[PDB]
């Protein structure tokens, strides 16, 4: 009922046969750095080339796939993370 944004789950939009509208919502805590999308084709002797997109563009488009073919994809999230060592118990006698 106020300012309390939880973790947003990934979602897909503009889905096609040879193209898809991959979209994700980065976490305010998640480091803001360009991400890399990896894709692998099974109906080809060689996989499709990856792509690098800035973090600001939580969305990206990948076309050139083939229908009826098994395409292996992988969404890797590379982020540094927030400052570690928040609050814990300090050892002391």
């Amino acid at each position: 009922g106020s300012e309390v944004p939880q973790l947003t789950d990934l979602s897909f939009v503009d889905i096609t046969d040879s193209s898809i509208g991959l979209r994700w919502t980065p976490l305010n805590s998640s480091t803001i750095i360009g991400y890399r999308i990896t894709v692998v084709a099974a109906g080809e002797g060689i996989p499709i080339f990856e792509d690098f997109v800035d973090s600001s563009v939580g969305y990206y488009t990948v076309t050139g796939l083939e229908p009826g073919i098994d395409y292996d994809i992988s969404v890797i999230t590379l982020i540094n993370g927030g400052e570690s060592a928040p609050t814990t118990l300090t050892q002391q006698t």
């Binding site: 979602s11 897909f12 889905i15 994809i73 992988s74 999230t77």
Partner: peptide, 26 residues
């Protein structure tokens, strides 16, 4: 809005990665 198909998050390799069968089905 409801999507044709949706998977889930998987914890592995000391990292969070999203994987599944293949591209968006139907």
């Amino acid at each position: 809005s409801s999507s044709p198909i949706q998977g889930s998050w998987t914890w592995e390799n000391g990292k969070w990665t999203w994987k599944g069968i293949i591209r968006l089905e139907q």
